[PDB]
């Protein structure tokens, strides 16, 4: 008898936990400093397409992808800077590159520190000597990520930074929303719409961009699972995006420093002075309401 079998590929994965809160998280740094899965008391708070994550060429669907130096795409997939023209794919390249672990702490929480540095390939699509160090801290029932966006070059650096969390969500109908806006932008069509404080998340596809928010936070409550997921953030984030599609069980409540095409329009665009850096943070709190 002749047999042949094989174990698939599996990237270097870090595991974080608080055996007290029964919280465990999986972060795989070589794939964009990406948080893939997160569980509290064994229940999946994040959605993650494992099979898809197997073809290293497919975009990640689930977890918490990082958007830098832009969120969304650009017209013609480009932007001009100082006469010259540059090409950037949707959501930048941070999501597509490996990060290095430059730190670890286990006293006040489970803390993993990752670094993403510019390089020749990166400078070819974004001419700025950037350096990012993100800190992922896991405690009790929450996940906090702290960012330091640095410009190690000689001229101002414009940029956009975003987190694209895929929160687990099966029974969408019972979902209670709480987005601090009065209007949103259906990025699909490009038409605006009034927001009353609720919406049909059961619709075939919802791709809303709330670029006018009145609170440094937002959340949603799912009775079926009897718990709420709240997103809070530092002032670098001025836009809230909501992604969801019929079938796939996830609801994205994403904090963006700026909307699509901000690198070109200047809307909520951000800068980092030469040989300087700025910091920010995003927080994720789960509650058993």
PDB file of C-alpha atoms in Angstrom:
ATOM      1  CA  UNK A   1       0.000   0.000   0.000  1.00  0.00           C
ATOM      2  CA  UNK A   2       1.315   3.419  -1.022  1.00  0.00           C
ATOM      3  CA  UNK A   3      -0.048   6.463   0.758  1.00  0.00           C
ATOM      4  CA  UNK A   4       0.546  10.191   0.504  1.00  0.00           C
ATOM      5  CA  UNK A   5      -0.736  12.952   2.775  1.00  0.00           C
ATOM      6  CA  UNK A   6       0.423  16.357   3.913  1.00  0.00           C
ATOM      7  CA  UNK A   7       0.019  18.899   6.706  1.00  0.00           C
ATOM      8  CA  UNK A   8      -0.658  22.387   5.280  1.00  0.00           C
ATOM      9  CA  UNK A   9       1.429  25.464   5.950  1.00  0.00           C
ATOM     10  CA  UNK A  10       0.970  27.336   9.229  1.00  0.00           C
ATOM     11  CA  UNK A  11       2.708  30.663   9.969  1.00  0.00           C
ATOM     12  CA  UNK A  12       4.536  31.630  13.120  1.00  0.00           C
ATOM     13  CA  UNK A  13       1.642  32.351  15.450  1.00  0.00           C
ATOM     14  CA  UNK A  14       1.731  34.059  18.824  1.00  0.00           C
ATOM     15  CA  UNK A  15      -0.817  33.147  21.493  1.00  0.00           C
ATOM     16  CA  UNK A  16      -1.954  35.598  24.147  1.00  0.00           C
ATOM     17  CA  UNK A  17      -4.002  34.859  27.248  1.00  0.00           C
ATOM     18  CA  UNK A  18      -5.443  35.806  30.627  1.00  0.00           C
ATOM     19  CA  UNK A  19      -6.327  32.449  32.234  1.00  0.00           C
ATOM     20  CA  UNK A  20      -8.363  34.507  34.675  1.00  0.00           C
ATOM     21  CA  UNK A  21     -10.772  36.077  32.216  1.00  0.00           C
ATOM     22  CA  UNK A  22     -10.460  32.961  30.080  1.00  0.00           C
ATOM     23  CA  UNK A  23      -9.254  35.151  27.232  1.00  0.00           C
ATOM     24  CA  UNK A  24      -6.989  33.995  24.432  1.00  0.00           C
ATOM     25  CA  UNK A  25      -5.855  35.687  21.245  1.00  0.00           C
ATOM     26  CA  UNK A  26      -3.922  34.579  18.178  1.00  0.00           C
ATOM     27  CA  UNK A  27      -1.623  37.031  16.415  1.00  0.00           C
ATOM     28  CA  UNK A  28       0.480  36.113  13.359  1.00  0.00           C
ATOM     29  CA  UNK A  29       3.067  38.952  12.731  1.00  0.00           C
ATOM     30  CA  UNK A  30       4.452  37.813   9.376  1.00  0.00           C
ATOM     31  CA  UNK A  31       1.011  38.389   7.831  1.00  0.00           C
ATOM     32  CA  UNK A  32       0.628  42.089   8.517  1.00  0.00           C
ATOM     33  CA  UNK A  33       0.921  42.088  12.320  1.00  0.00           C
ATOM     34  CA  UNK A  34      -2.537  40.564  12.195  1.00  0.00           C
ATOM     35  CA  UNK A  35      -4.778  39.538  15.101  1.00  0.00           C
ATOM     36  CA  UNK A  36      -6.610  36.590  13.546  1.00  0.00           C
ATOM     37  CA  UNK A  37      -8.745  35.094  16.305  1.00  0.00           C
ATOM     38  CA  UNK A  38      -9.861  36.156  19.780  1.00  0.00           C
ATOM     39  CA  UNK A  39     -11.904  34.219  22.376  1.00  0.00           C
ATOM     40  CA  UNK A  40     -13.402  35.120  25.736  1.00  0.00           C
ATOM     41  CA  UNK A  41     -14.607  32.181  27.806  1.00  0.00           C
ATOM     42  CA  UNK A  42     -14.230  30.110  24.662  1.00  0.00           C
ATOM     43  CA  UNK A  43     -16.678  32.100  22.571  1.00  0.00           C
ATOM     44  CA  UNK A  44     -15.337  33.612  19.288  1.00  0.00           C
ATOM     45  CA  UNK A  45     -15.472  37.378  19.460  1.00  0.00           C
ATOM     46  CA  UNK A  46     -13.753  37.731  16.050  1.00  0.00           C
ATOM     47  CA  UNK A  47     -14.680  36.106  12.730  1.00  0.00           C
ATOM     48  CA  UNK A  48     -11.961  34.385  10.726  1.00  0.00           C
ATOM     49  CA  UNK A  49     -11.925  32.534   7.422  1.00  0.00           C
ATOM     50  CA  UNK A  50      -9.301  29.831   8.096  1.00  0.00           C
ATOM     51  CA  UNK A  51      -9.499  28.054   4.755  1.00  0.00           C
ATOM     52  CA  UNK A  52      -9.033  31.265   2.825  1.00  0.00           C
ATOM     53  CA  UNK A  53      -6.110  32.227   5.095  1.00  0.00           C
ATOM     54  CA  UNK A  54      -4.373  29.185   3.646  1.00  0.00           C
ATOM     55  CA  UNK A  55      -3.734  30.605   0.160  1.00  0.00           C
ATOM     56  CA  UNK A  56      -1.103  33.222   1.079  1.00  0.00           C
ATOM     57  CA  UNK A  57      -2.197  35.235  -1.973  1.00  0.00           C
ATOM     58  CA  UNK A  58      -5.807  35.877  -0.934  1.00  0.00           C
ATOM     59  CA  UNK A  59      -6.709  38.940   1.106  1.00  0.00           C
ATOM     60  CA  UNK A  60      -7.440  38.124   4.710  1.00  0.00           C
ATOM     61  CA  UNK A  61     -11.145  37.922   5.581  1.00  0.00           C
ATOM     62  CA  UNK A  62     -11.573  38.100   9.313  1.00  0.00           C
ATOM     63  CA  UNK A  63      -9.417  39.115  12.229  1.00  0.00           C
ATOM     64  CA  UNK A  64      -8.224  42.701  12.466  1.00  0.00           C
ATOM     65  CA  UNK A  65      -6.486  43.892   9.280  1.00  0.00           C
ATOM     66  CA  UNK A  66      -4.426  47.098   9.418  1.00  0.00           C
ATOM     67  CA  UNK A  67      -4.953  49.858   6.839  1.00  0.00           C
ATOM     68  CA  UNK A  68      -1.857  52.003   6.098  1.00  0.00           C
ATOM     69  CA  UNK A  69      -0.881  54.440   4.574  1.00  0.00           C
ATOM     70  CA  UNK A  70      -4.470  54.688   3.262  1.00  0.00           C
ATOM     71  CA  UNK A  71      -7.932  53.338   3.977  1.00  0.00           C
ATOM     72  CA  UNK A  72      -9.945  52.212   0.965  1.00  0.00           C
ATOM     73  CA  UNK A  73      -8.665  52.777  -2.552  1.00  0.00           C
ATOM     74  CA  UNK A  74      -7.523  55.719  -4.646  1.00  0.00           C
ATOM     75  CA  UNK A  75      -8.869  56.851  -8.031  1.00  0.00           C
ATOM     76  CA  UNK A  76      -6.674  55.191 -10.659  1.00  0.00           C
ATOM     77  CA  UNK A  77      -4.982  53.613  -7.639  1.00  0.00           C
ATOM     78  CA  UNK A  78      -2.595  56.553  -7.454  1.00  0.00           C
ATOM     79  CA  UNK A  79      -1.722  59.921  -5.941  1.00  0.00           C
ATOM     80  CA  UNK A  80       0.780  62.559  -6.951  1.00  0.00           C
ATOM     81  CA  UNK A  81       3.353  63.940  -4.550  1.00  0.00           C
ATOM     82  CA  UNK A  82       5.893  66.605  -5.429  1.00  0.00           C
ATOM     83  CA  UNK A  83       5.208  66.239  -9.142  1.00  0.00           C
ATOM     84  CA  UNK A  84       5.925  62.506  -9.113  1.00  0.00           C
ATOM     85  CA  UNK A  85       3.151  59.897  -9.251  1.00  0.00           C
ATOM     86  CA  UNK A  86       2.713  56.905  -6.912  1.00  0.00           C
ATOM     87  CA  UNK A  87       0.654  53.697  -7.062  1.00  0.00           C
ATOM     88  CA  UNK A  88      -1.023  52.262  -3.958  1.00  0.00           C
ATOM     89  CA  UNK A  89      -3.387  49.308  -3.700  1.00  0.00           C
ATOM     90  CA  UNK A  90      -6.555  49.413  -1.615  1.00  0.00           C
ATOM     91  CA  UNK A  91      -5.719  49.697   2.115  1.00  0.00           C
ATOM     92  CA  UNK A  92      -2.018  50.129   1.519  1.00  0.00           C
ATOM     93  CA  UNK A  93       0.635  47.513   2.198  1.00  0.00           C
ATOM     94  CA  UNK A  94       0.840  47.179   5.970  1.00  0.00           C
ATOM     95  CA  UNK A  95      -1.668  44.325   5.768  1.00  0.00           C
ATOM     96  CA  UNK A  96       0.526  42.569   3.170  1.00  0.00           C
ATOM     97  CA  UNK A  97       3.915  42.688   4.937  1.00  0.00           C
ATOM     98  CA  UNK A  98       5.669  40.881   7.772  1.00  0.00           C
ATOM     99  CA  UNK A  99       6.182  42.719  11.076  1.00  0.00           C
ATOM    100  CA  UNK A 100       8.896  41.881  13.658  1.00  0.00           C
ATOM    101  CA  UNK A 101       8.342  41.245  17.355  1.00  0.00           C
ATOM    102  CA  UNK A 102      10.441  43.811  19.248  1.00  0.00           C
ATOM    103  CA  UNK A 103       8.986  43.317  22.692  1.00  0.00           C
ATOM    104  CA  UNK A 104       6.902  41.339  25.145  1.00  0.00           C
ATOM    105  CA  UNK A 105       5.453  41.946  28.601  1.00  0.00           C
ATOM    106  CA  UNK A 106       3.326  39.791  30.837  1.00  0.00           C
ATOM    107  CA  UNK A 107       2.762  41.798  34.036  1.00  0.00           C
ATOM    108  CA  UNK A 108      -0.267  44.085  33.657  1.00  0.00           C
ATOM    109  CA  UNK A 109      -1.587  42.120  30.691  1.00  0.00           C
ATOM    110  CA  UNK A 110      -0.533  39.930  27.757  1.00  0.00           C
ATOM    111  CA  UNK A 111       1.454  42.357  25.637  1.00  0.00           C
ATOM    112  CA  UNK A 112       3.087  41.820  22.258  1.00  0.00           C
ATOM    113  CA  UNK A 113       5.032  44.603  20.506  1.00  0.00           C
ATOM    114  CA  UNK A 114       5.405  44.546  16.711  1.00  0.00           C
ATOM    115  CA  UNK A 115       7.303  46.684  14.238  1.00  0.00           C
ATOM    116  CA  UNK A 116       6.794  47.572  10.600  1.00  0.00           C
ATOM    117  CA  UNK A 117       9.502  49.568   8.887  1.00  0.00           C
ATOM    118  CA  UNK A 118       9.624  51.164   5.493  1.00  0.00           C
ATOM    119  CA  UNK A 119      11.871  49.619   2.806  1.00  0.00           C
ATOM    120  CA  UNK A 120      12.851  50.018  -0.873  1.00  0.00           C
ATOM    121  CA  UNK A 121       9.662  48.370  -2.107  1.00  0.00           C
ATOM    122  CA  UNK A 122       7.574  50.515   0.203  1.00  0.00           C
ATOM    123  CA  UNK A 123       9.333  53.775  -0.733  1.00  0.00           C
ATOM    124  CA  UNK A 124       8.497  53.000  -4.340  1.00  0.00           C
ATOM    125  CA  UNK A 125       4.759  53.336  -3.614  1.00  0.00           C
ATOM    126  CA  UNK A 126       4.955  55.734  -0.649  1.00  0.00           C
ATOM    127  CA  UNK A 127       8.111  57.969  -0.538  1.00  0.00           C
ATOM    128  CA  UNK A 128       8.262  58.377   3.250  1.00  0.00           C
ATOM    129  CA  UNK A 129      10.636  56.810   5.775  1.00  0.00           C
ATOM    130  CA  UNK A 130       7.886  55.534   8.068  1.00  0.00           C
ATOM    131  CA  UNK A 131       8.236  53.328  11.128  1.00  0.00           C
ATOM    132  CA  UNK A 132       5.306  51.796  12.984  1.00  0.00           C
ATOM    133  CA  UNK A 133       5.396  50.082  16.364  1.00  0.00           C
ATOM    134  CA  UNK A 134       2.059  48.688  17.504  1.00  0.00           C
ATOM    135  CA  UNK A 135       1.441  47.308  20.952  1.00  0.00           C
ATOM    136  CA  UNK A 136      -1.252  44.685  21.384  1.00  0.00           C
ATOM    137  CA  UNK A 137      -2.387  44.344  24.997  1.00  0.00           C
ATOM    138  CA  UNK A 138      -4.838  41.670  26.100  1.00  0.00           C
ATOM    139  CA  UNK A 139      -6.551  41.813  29.498  1.00  0.00           C
ATOM    140  CA  UNK A 140      -9.836  40.688  30.966  1.00  0.00           C
ATOM    141  CA  UNK A 141     -12.452  41.140  28.274  1.00  0.00           C
ATOM    142  CA  UNK A 142     -10.729  43.641  26.032  1.00  0.00           C
ATOM    143  CA  UNK A 143      -8.070  44.188  23.384  1.00  0.00           C
ATOM    144  CA  UNK A 144      -6.166  47.450  23.160  1.00  0.00           C
ATOM    145  CA  UNK A 145      -3.770  48.278  20.351  1.00  0.00           C
ATOM    146  CA  UNK A 146      -1.460  51.230  20.685  1.00  0.00           C
ATOM    147  CA  UNK A 147       0.251  52.786  17.715  1.00  0.00           C
ATOM    148  CA  UNK A 148       3.214  55.073  17.228  1.00  0.00           C
ATOM    149  CA  UNK A 149       3.439  56.352  13.663  1.00  0.00           C
ATOM    150  CA  UNK A 150       6.927  57.666  13.050  1.00  0.00           C
ATOM    151  CA  UNK A 151       8.470  59.621  10.232  1.00  0.00           C
ATOM    152  CA  UNK A 152      12.206  58.908  10.143  1.00  0.00           C
ATOM    153  CA  UNK A 153      12.639  60.972   7.003  1.00  0.00           C
ATOM    154  CA  UNK A 154      13.313  64.629   6.173  1.00  0.00           C
ATOM    155  CA  UNK A 155       9.868  65.831   5.089  1.00  0.00           C
ATOM    156  CA  UNK A 156       6.262  65.824   6.305  1.00  0.00           C
ATOM    157  CA  UNK A 157       4.479  62.508   5.902  1.00  0.00           C
ATOM    158  CA  UNK A 158       0.796  62.412   5.039  1.00  0.00           C
ATOM    159  CA  UNK A 159      -1.032  59.216   5.949  1.00  0.00           C
ATOM    160  CA  UNK A 160      -4.153  57.336   6.937  1.00  0.00           C
ATOM    161  CA  UNK A 161      -4.396  54.521   9.455  1.00  0.00           C
ATOM    162  CA  UNK A 162      -7.271  52.135  10.027  1.00  0.00           C
ATOM    163  CA  UNK A 163      -8.301  48.946  11.784  1.00  0.00           C
ATOM    164  CA  UNK A 164     -10.691  46.587  10.043  1.00  0.00           C
ATOM    165  CA  UNK A 165     -12.013  44.287  12.809  1.00  0.00           C
ATOM    166  CA  UNK A 166     -14.342  41.465  11.751  1.00  0.00           C
ATOM    167  CA  UNK A 167     -16.632  40.890  14.743  1.00  0.00           C
ATOM    168  CA  UNK A 168     -18.457  37.553  14.930  1.00  0.00           C
ATOM    169  CA  UNK A 169     -22.113  37.991  14.154  1.00  0.00           C
ATOM    170  CA  UNK A 170     -24.584  35.304  13.069  1.00  0.00           C
ATOM    171  CA  UNK A 171     -28.025  36.591  14.007  1.00  0.00           C
ATOM    172  CA  UNK A 172     -27.826  40.066  12.466  1.00  0.00           C
ATOM    173  CA  UNK A 173     -31.530  40.897  12.782  1.00  0.00           C
ATOM    174  CA  UNK A 174     -31.411  41.288  16.557  1.00  0.00           C
ATOM    175  CA  UNK A 175     -28.318  43.488  16.393  1.00  0.00           C
ATOM    176  CA  UNK A 176     -28.670  46.754  18.316  1.00  0.00           C
ATOM    177  CA  UNK A 177     -26.475  49.541  16.876  1.00  0.00           C
ATOM    178  CA  UNK A 178     -24.989  52.694  18.373  1.00  0.00           C
ATOM    179  CA  UNK A 179     -23.063  54.744  15.837  1.00  0.00           C
ATOM    180  CA  UNK A 180     -22.535  58.471  16.716  1.00  0.00           C
ATOM    181  CA  UNK A 181     -23.502  60.003  13.381  1.00  0.00           C
ATOM    182  CA  UNK A 182     -26.531  61.390  11.576  1.00  0.00           C
ATOM    183  CA  UNK A 183     -25.598  60.384   8.041  1.00  0.00           C
ATOM    184  CA  UNK A 184     -23.498  57.794   6.250  1.00  0.00           C
ATOM    185  CA  UNK A 185     -21.988  57.154   2.834  1.00  0.00           C
ATOM    186  CA  UNK A 186     -22.784  53.977   0.886  1.00  0.00           C
ATOM    187  CA  UNK A 187     -19.318  53.531  -0.548  1.00  0.00           C
ATOM    188  CA  UNK A 188     -20.828  51.165  -3.104  1.00  0.00           C
ATOM    189  CA  UNK A 189     -23.027  53.720  -4.863  1.00  0.00           C
ATOM    190  CA  UNK A 190     -21.463  56.862  -3.435  1.00  0.00           C
ATOM    191  CA  UNK A 191     -24.802  58.316  -2.340  1.00  0.00           C
ATOM    192  CA  UNK A 192     -25.394  59.655   1.167  1.00  0.00           C
ATOM    193  CA  UNK A 193     -28.214  58.626   3.488  1.00  0.00           C
ATOM    194  CA  UNK A 194     -29.743  59.720   6.754  1.00  0.00           C
ATOM    195  CA  UNK A 195     -29.019  57.604   9.806  1.00  0.00           C
ATOM    196  CA  UNK A 196     -31.721  57.256  12.461  1.00  0.00           C
ATOM    197  CA  UNK A 197     -29.876  54.942  14.807  1.00  0.00           C
ATOM    198  CA  UNK A 198     -30.661  51.582  13.251  1.00  0.00           C
ATOM    199  CA  UNK A 199     -30.290  49.638  10.019  1.00  0.00           C
ATOM    200  CA  UNK A 200     -31.019  46.298   8.352  1.00  0.00           C
ATOM    201  CA  UNK A 201     -27.754  44.383   8.751  1.00  0.00           C
ATOM    202  CA  UNK A 202     -29.521  41.483   7.059  1.00  0.00           C
ATOM    203  CA  UNK A 203     -29.337  43.356   3.737  1.00  0.00           C
ATOM    204  CA  UNK A 204     -27.325  41.729   0.904  1.00  0.00           C
ATOM    205  CA  UNK A 205     -24.447  44.134   1.510  1.00  0.00           C
ATOM    206  CA  UNK A 206     -23.842  47.170   3.717  1.00  0.00           C
ATOM    207  CA  UNK A 207     -20.704  49.252   3.108  1.00  0.00           C
ATOM    208  CA  UNK A 208     -21.280  52.427   5.105  1.00  0.00           C
ATOM    209  CA  UNK A 209     -18.764  55.185   5.870  1.00  0.00           C
ATOM    210  CA  UNK A 210     -19.779  57.538   8.694  1.00  0.00           C
ATOM    211  CA  UNK A 211     -17.257  60.347   8.248  1.00  0.00           C
ATOM    212  CA  UNK A 212     -19.013  62.708  10.692  1.00  0.00           C
ATOM    213  CA  UNK A 213     -19.083  61.277  14.216  1.00  0.00           C
ATOM    214  CA  UNK A 214     -19.918  62.896  17.548  1.00  0.00           C
ATOM    215  CA  UNK A 215     -18.341  60.334  19.884  1.00  0.00           C
ATOM    216  CA  UNK A 216     -14.882  58.772  20.213  1.00  0.00           C
ATOM    217  CA  UNK A 217     -16.707  55.437  20.455  1.00  0.00           C
ATOM    218  CA  UNK A 218     -19.366  53.115  19.040  1.00  0.00           C
ATOM    219  CA  UNK A 219     -20.824  49.670  19.779  1.00  0.00           C
ATOM    220  CA  UNK A 220     -23.457  47.070  18.984  1.00  0.00           C
ATOM    221  CA  UNK A 221     -25.429  44.592  21.050  1.00  0.00           C
ATOM    222  CA  UNK A 222     -26.268  41.069  19.929  1.00  0.00           C
ATOM    223  CA  UNK A 223     -28.984  39.497  22.108  1.00  0.00           C
ATOM    224  CA  UNK A 224     -28.685  36.066  20.507  1.00  0.00           C
ATOM    225  CA  UNK A 225     -25.226  35.861  22.050  1.00  0.00           C
ATOM    226  CA  UNK A 226     -26.318  38.209  24.825  1.00  0.00           C
ATOM    227  CA  UNK A 227     -23.308  40.547  24.682  1.00  0.00           C
ATOM    228  CA  UNK A 228     -22.130  43.877  23.316  1.00  0.00           C
ATOM    229  CA  UNK A 229     -18.980  44.788  21.422  1.00  0.00           C
ATOM    230  CA  UNK A 230     -17.760  48.370  21.849  1.00  0.00           C
ATOM    231  CA  UNK A 231     -15.149  50.221  19.794  1.00  0.00           C
ATOM    232  CA  UNK A 232     -13.386  53.216  21.345  1.00  0.00           C
ATOM    233  CA  UNK A 233     -10.501  55.271  19.915  1.00  0.00           C
ATOM    234  CA  UNK A 234      -8.028  58.127  20.313  1.00  0.00           C
ATOM    235  CA  UNK A 235      -8.614  61.386  18.381  1.00  0.00           C
ATOM    236  CA  UNK A 236      -6.612  60.272  15.327  1.00  0.00           C
ATOM    237  CA  UNK A 237      -9.756  58.427  14.233  1.00  0.00           C
ATOM    238  CA  UNK A 238     -12.519  60.576  12.772  1.00  0.00           C
ATOM    239  CA  UNK A 239     -14.332  58.074  10.554  1.00  0.00           C
ATOM    240  CA  UNK A 240     -16.384  54.965  11.263  1.00  0.00           C
ATOM    241  CA  UNK A 241     -16.895  52.272   8.631  1.00  0.00           C
ATOM    242  CA  UNK A 242     -19.420  49.419   8.684  1.00  0.00           C
ATOM    243  CA  UNK A 243     -18.926  46.334   6.456  1.00  0.00           C
ATOM    244  CA  UNK A 244     -21.172  43.276   6.236  1.00  0.00           C
ATOM    245  CA  UNK A 245     -22.551  40.869   3.640  1.00  0.00           C
ATOM    246  CA  UNK A 246     -25.376  38.354   3.371  1.00  0.00           C
ATOM    247  CA  UNK A 247     -24.127  34.921   4.407  1.00  0.00           C
ATOM    248  CA  UNK A 248     -20.721  35.553   5.989  1.00  0.00           C
ATOM    249  CA  UNK A 249     -21.190  35.869   9.758  1.00  0.00           C
ATOM    250  CA  UNK A 250     -19.313  39.067  10.620  1.00  0.00           C
ATOM    251  CA  UNK A 251     -19.968  42.746  11.240  1.00  0.00           C
ATOM    252  CA  UNK A 252     -17.145  45.244  10.782  1.00  0.00           C
ATOM    253  CA  UNK A 253     -17.284  48.392  12.927  1.00  0.00           C
ATOM    254  CA  UNK A 254     -14.051  50.008  11.769  1.00  0.00           C
ATOM    255  CA  UNK A 255     -12.176  53.098  13.046  1.00  0.00           C
ATOM    256  CA  UNK A 256     -10.399  55.050  10.249  1.00  0.00           C
ATOM    257  CA  UNK A 257      -8.260  58.141  10.714  1.00  0.00           C
ATOM    258  CA  UNK A 258      -9.729  59.329   7.436  1.00  0.00           C
ATOM    259  CA  UNK A 259     -12.108  58.265   4.613  1.00  0.00           C
ATOM    260  CA  UNK A 260     -11.360  56.881   1.163  1.00  0.00           C
ATOM    261  CA  UNK A 261      -9.097  59.037  -1.025  1.00  0.00           C
ATOM    262  CA  UNK A 262      -7.977  61.155   1.928  1.00  0.00           C
ATOM    263  CA  UNK A 263      -4.360  61.106   0.656  1.00  0.00           C
ATOM    264  CA  UNK A 264      -5.665  63.029  -2.381  1.00  0.00           C
ATOM    265  CA  UNK A 265      -8.529  65.143  -1.035  1.00  0.00           C
ATOM    266  CA  UNK A 266      -6.922  66.011   2.285  1.00  0.00           C
ATOM    267  CA  UNK A 267     -10.090  65.097   4.169  1.00  0.00           C
ATOM    268  CA  UNK A 268      -9.216  64.111   7.758  1.00  0.00           C
ATOM    269  CA  UNK A 269      -5.754  63.454   6.370  1.00  0.00           C
ATOM    270  CA  UNK A 270      -2.956  63.191   8.960  1.00  0.00           C
ATOM    271  CA  UNK A 271       0.708  64.176   9.050  1.00  0.00           C
ATOM    272  CA  UNK A 272       3.912  63.360  10.929  1.00  0.00           C
ATOM    273  CA  UNK A 273       6.659  65.978  10.950  1.00  0.00           C
ATOM    274  CA  UNK A 274      10.223  64.954   9.951  1.00  0.00           C
ATOM    275  CA  UNK A 275      12.169  62.886  12.485  1.00  0.00           C
ATOM    276  CA  UNK A 276       9.047  62.834  14.649  1.00  0.00           C
ATOM    277  CA  UNK A 277       6.169  60.504  15.481  1.00  0.00           C
ATOM    278  CA  UNK A 278       2.631  60.552  16.850  1.00  0.00           C
ATOM    279  CA  UNK A 279       0.729  57.982  18.866  1.00  0.00           C
ATOM    280  CA  UNK A 280      -2.824  56.725  18.978  1.00  0.00           C
ATOM    281  CA  UNK A 281      -4.881  53.817  20.203  1.00  0.00           C
ATOM    282  CA  UNK A 282      -8.010  51.804  19.504  1.00  0.00           C
ATOM    283  CA  UNK A 283      -9.866  49.738  22.095  1.00  0.00           C
ATOM    284  CA  UNK A 284     -12.187  46.765  21.955  1.00  0.00           C
ATOM    285  CA  UNK A 285     -14.406  45.942  24.911  1.00  0.00           C
ATOM    286  CA  UNK A 286     -16.743  42.970  25.156  1.00  0.00           C
ATOM    287  CA  UNK A 287     -19.622  42.895  27.663  1.00  0.00           C
ATOM    288  CA  UNK A 288     -22.122  40.212  28.679  1.00  0.00           C
ATOM    289  CA  UNK A 289     -25.243  42.367  28.611  1.00  0.00           C
TER     290      UNK A 289
END
